Amino acid sequence: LSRNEIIQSYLSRQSSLLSSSARQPHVLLPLPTPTDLPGLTREVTQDDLDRIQAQQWPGVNGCEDTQGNWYDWTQCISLDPHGDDGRLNILPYVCLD
Amino acid sequence: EYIDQGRNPQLYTKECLERALAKNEQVKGKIDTMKKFKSLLIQELSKVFPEDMAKYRSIR
Amino acid sequence: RKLNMSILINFLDLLDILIRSPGSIKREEKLEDLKLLFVHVHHLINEYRPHQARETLRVMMEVQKRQRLETAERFQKH
Amino acid sequence: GPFYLMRELPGSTELTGSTNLITHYNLEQAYNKFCDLPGMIDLPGSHDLRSLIEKPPILGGGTMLSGFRLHTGPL
């Protein structure tokens, strides 16, 4: 934060893009009531999986959005969840790296 | 003896003026950065979630 | 994320204060307290939370095998 | 207002060097009695070979040839 240049700015931008990452509608997935800890104190069953995979619930699979934005547990759909105009093949909802 | 070495406080006065100008420029840059941060916070609030961003930007 | 945004805002405010009132000598001491927060930062944003979700994905792993079993169902169709 | 876990507010006005410390030094009268042209015009000038010896005192802070050229009466 003391000495900054064009190379330093490029390195900071690359580090930020590596660490943190026309409609671009962000699906504001709200805390689902069907969980396991402070949810319904129940184990993982077919009901919770079907509610998180078909309905808009970010329990296990993920809360699907409009415009065919199917966000399942391992669905790498080409959506536009980012803040840019690139609707490329985004990673899965889990994105386990 | 050091003051009578054929010099004067003009250099110190110029250094103080340069330091004041640099402090003013840094304060202006910090104000611009704070304005940009507030604008980005308001944008993220209107985009994803406004409650947490508003609570963090209003009264920290 | 909200706490990180608040910390950035507080850092900007502290920089503005030091530019406006530089007589503060205990501010650096707060950095030491950040070490405590650094403990929490030890699991902050990068590479530790998804593993927990991977636990659930463990079950999905067998589901992947079931997907292969789906292909194996074609053998039954044979 | 200030909820739980709110950080402390700094002082109102502590020892600060952001103010105009030029006027507190009382450098106005020096600049008026000089007339950075004011400080530069006072280096070799005082106010508005013996000369070579006198010029050295303001700069740094044989014999018969110089004595034959000292022919002067009372005026």
Side-chain angles (χ1 to χ4, degrees), chain A residues 22 25 30 32 34 38-39 54 58-59 62 68 81 83 86 92, chain B residues 6 9 20 22 29 50 54, chain C residues 22-23 50 53 72, chain D residues 1-35 38-39 44-45 56-57 60-62 66-67 73-74:
Chain D
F3 293 152
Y4 70 99
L5 192 64
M6 287 307 175
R7 289 173 167 164
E8 53 92 21
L9 279 295
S12 158
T13 297
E14 48 265 42
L15 291 173
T16 307
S18 306
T19 43
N20 264 317
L21 75 162
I22 307 95
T23 42
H24 194 69
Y25 182 69
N26 307 329
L27 205 51
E28 189 53 276
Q29 77 296 328
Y31 187 82
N32 310 130
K33 68 102 173 180
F34 287 164
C35 289
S66 87

